[PDB]
Structure 1
Amino acid sequence: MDIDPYKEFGATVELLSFLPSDFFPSVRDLLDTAAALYRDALESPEHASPHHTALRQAILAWGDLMTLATWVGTNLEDPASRDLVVSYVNTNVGLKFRQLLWFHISALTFGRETVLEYLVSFGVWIRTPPAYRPPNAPIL
């Protein structure tokens, strides 16, 4: 089955192909962000905004990917393969995740629309070749 996690929110990975894997901040940098004004706002039985409602999944979806990524470092009798495992999740999988995460965050913070209003202004800064590219990205 193929569905777009963003779809409903009005987004689509179709435009996330651009975003360089070095864009969104490392996972931990976000995990700490969970302690924001959002920490409490989740351990509370309230749907509120469908945003977190889903995030809360990804969180644990990973909350397990971190409670299992450790079940590897222990019960494992092959000290030559467990070195090429975490070298995929925290790298090639954090990617198709850091976005999944970061996303929601940077939407509740200020506003949803206020975000798309960027992805677009970015989805032009990226394509447009280097030599033909100003210093940094937009603002409001």
Structure 2
Amino acid sequence: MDIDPYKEFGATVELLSFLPSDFFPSVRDLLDTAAALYRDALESPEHASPHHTALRQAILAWGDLMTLATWVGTNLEDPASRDLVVSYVNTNVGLKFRQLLWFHISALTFGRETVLEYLVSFGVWIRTPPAYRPPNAPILSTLPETT
């Protein structure tokens, strides 16, 4: 039903429609990335931030898909369509999931504020006719060291 998984973070999806599919890091990369940067902090009993919390679901709910897709190729007698699903997933979904992921992840490094204040600007970048924006998009930078 009508419920945004971001409203909770003073944010929205209606907001990330803008992200180019060509933007995100291979899922695999994101997973690796993440858990290699926080693991101890996750296999942890402290729901430190709601981001921490939230995240994890995403991961498992997904780990249920890569722990699914390997039940599909295993238990299926149709070589033509068994390969067609994986496409939907690793493509039409890797997005719905990378989209999400990266968000939290990177964000759990630059606060929220430091982030949203990113999207904001970027929103416009892409939103602007190829012939008008600089080949150099705006990037994630830990704000400067003068507070």
State the TM-score bracket (shorter-chain normalisation).
over 0.9
Deviation track 1:87-131 (CA, whole Å, cap 9, x = no partner) reads 111011111110111110011112211111110110111111111
Q: Which has the higher contact order (CA 8 A, sep 6+)?
A: 1
Q: Which runs of 4+ in 1 moved over 4 A?
A: none
Partner of 1:85, secondary structure, is helix
User: TM-score, normalising length from structure 1?
Assistant: 0.94
Structure 2 runs not aligned, ≥5 long: 140-147
How far apart are residue 35 of structure 1 and its match? 3.0
Identity %: 100
TM-score in terms of structure 2 length: 0.90
* Residue matched to 1:138: 138
Distance 1:58 1:65, change over 3 A: same
Q: How far apart, in 2, do the equivalents of 1:77 and 1:135 lie? A: 48
1:34 deviates by 2.4
Q: How many residues align?
A: 139
More displaced 10-residue stretch of structure 1: 30-39 or 72-81: 30-39
Partner of 1:26: 26
Counting helix residues as a fraction of each chain, which structure ranks higher?
Answer: 2
Counterparts of 1:118 and 1:95 in 2: how far apart (Å)?
Answer: 20
Q: Which runs of 5+ in 1 are unaligned?
A: none
Cα deviation, residue 4, structure 1: 0.7
Task: Using the TM superposition, give the Cα deviation of residue 52 of structure 1 relative to its aligned residue in structure 2, in angstroms.
Answer: 1.7
